């Protein structure tokens, strides 16, 4: 693959500070590689693989993102996600590759900090997370907690893009995810509490929704038992219940409804509910009654009311 090497040569030229001739070579080979890569997803022409991996192209394309023009950056993402999906027999060679070249993952993560390459970075990153091995390397790294900064990042676009990656990492692979959340409880949920206190509307919303999703998965049962035993967390759901915004309240309900539904509430949790019994009934009875379509919701409300009434 002359192409692989010309792209690397052509990119090394850009990497300094001719630019037109290289800027134009780079696009061209970017287009050629896209064009080669449109064929199928174990024969001696695994020499092409050995060649790709050896050349270090996949890092350079990621590391050099910023020297590349806007349509170029889409090509890179496309090229890259294409190489990462390919299978040789049962293995996924690129997955094993990046296991040995972890800085590819950490460069992609770090891209959310660059408004000019954020969105390409997330495209490549969500493609990596598809693979338990790379998700695992990202979950167990300290760089993971950068997501709490990025999701409140800047512009709407990026922040929503970071969150989707955030979300996927925490839900796609259940056993690994449950495992992360158990080993990192205090740290993770202290950081998550900060998100719940956010003044940003999209932030509380997304986080609330994800929270309830995290807590209702049977894989996270212990994470959950714990979380719903903390008076502090309950007061937080309850205060989110009176948020000026009907979408926040709705999401807070779904976290709230878990604290109450739990057959064994710790004494502190019980006591909170009882302290505010009358006020709870009065809230629930009036709470978003115009939402009639959602049967499960109506039922949940009607149950909490009895439970509470039944304390």
Q: How many Å apart are CA 115 and CA 110, to the nearest integer?
A: 11
Q: How many helices (H) and strands (E) does the chain have?
A: 20, 0
For residues 3-12, one letter each, b for 16 or more C-beta atoms within 10 angstroms of the residue's C-beta and e for the rest, the string is ebeebbebbe
Cβ-contact 128, 81 below 8 angstroms = no
91 bridge partner residues: 88
Cβ-contact 120, 111 below 8 angstroms = yes
- Specify whether the backbone of 91 is left (phi greater than 0), alpha (psi in -120 to 50) or beta: beta
How many C-beta atoms lie closer than 10 Å to residue 122's C-beta? 24
CB-based contacts of 32-35 (< 8 A; 24+ apart in sequence): 32/3, 33/3, 33/4, 33/7, 33/75, 33/79, 34/75, 34/78, 34/79, 34/82
88 bridge partner residues: 91
CB-based contacts of 63-68 (< 8 A; 24+ apart in sequence): 63/107, 64/11, 64/14, 64/15, 65/111, 65/117, 65/120, 65/121, 66/114, 66/116, 66/117, 67/11, 67/14, 67/15, 68/14, 68/26, 68/30
Cβ-contact 110, 148 below 8 angstroms = no
The tokens for 8 are 């690397």
The tokens for 193 are 């509490």
Structural domains of the chain, with CATH: 1-311 (1.25.10.10)
Going by C-beta distance under 8 Å and a sequence separation of 6 or more, which residues neighbour residue 185? 223, 226
């Amino acid at each position: 693959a002359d192409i692989v090497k010309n792209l690397k040569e052509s990119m090394a030229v850009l990497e300094k500070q001719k630019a037109e001739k290289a800027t134009e070579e780079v696009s061209k080979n970017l287009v050629a590689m896209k064009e080669i890569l449109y064929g199928t997803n174990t024969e001696a022409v695994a020499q092409l693989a050995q060649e790709l991996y050896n050349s270090g192209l996949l890092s350079t394309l990621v590391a050099d993102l910023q020297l590349i023009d806007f349509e170029g950056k889409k090509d890179v993402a496309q090229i890259f996600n294409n190489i990462l999906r390919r299978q040789i027999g049962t293995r996924t060679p690129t997955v094993e590759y990046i296991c040995t070249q972890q800085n590819i993952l950490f460069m992609l993560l770090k891209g959310y900090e660059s408004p000019e390459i954020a969105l390409n970075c997330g495209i490549m990153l969500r493609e990596c997370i598809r693979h338990e091995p790379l998700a695992k390397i990202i979950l167990w790294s300290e760089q993971f907690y950068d997501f709490f900064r990025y999701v409140e990042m800047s512009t709407f676009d990026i922040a929503s893009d970071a969150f989707a990656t955030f979300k996927d990492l925490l839900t796609r692979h259940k056993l690994l995810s449950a495992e992360f959340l158990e080993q990192h409880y205090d740290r993770f949920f202290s950081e998550y509490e900060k998100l719940l206190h956010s003044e940003n509307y999209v932030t509380k919303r997304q986080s609330l929704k994800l929270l309830g999703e995290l807590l209702l998965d049977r894989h996270n049962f212990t994470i959950m038992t714990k979380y719903i035993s903390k008076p502090e967390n309950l007061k937080l759901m309850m205060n989110l219940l009176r948020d000026k915004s009907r979408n926040i309240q709705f999401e807070a309900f779904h976290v709230f409804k878990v604290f109450v539904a739990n057959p064994n509430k710790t004494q502190p949790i019980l006591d909170i509910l009882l302290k505010n019994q009358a006020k709870l009934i009065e809230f629930l009875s009036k709470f978003q009654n115009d939402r009639t379509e959602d049967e499960q919701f109506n039922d949940e409300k009607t149950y909490l009311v009895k439970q509470i009434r039944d304390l």
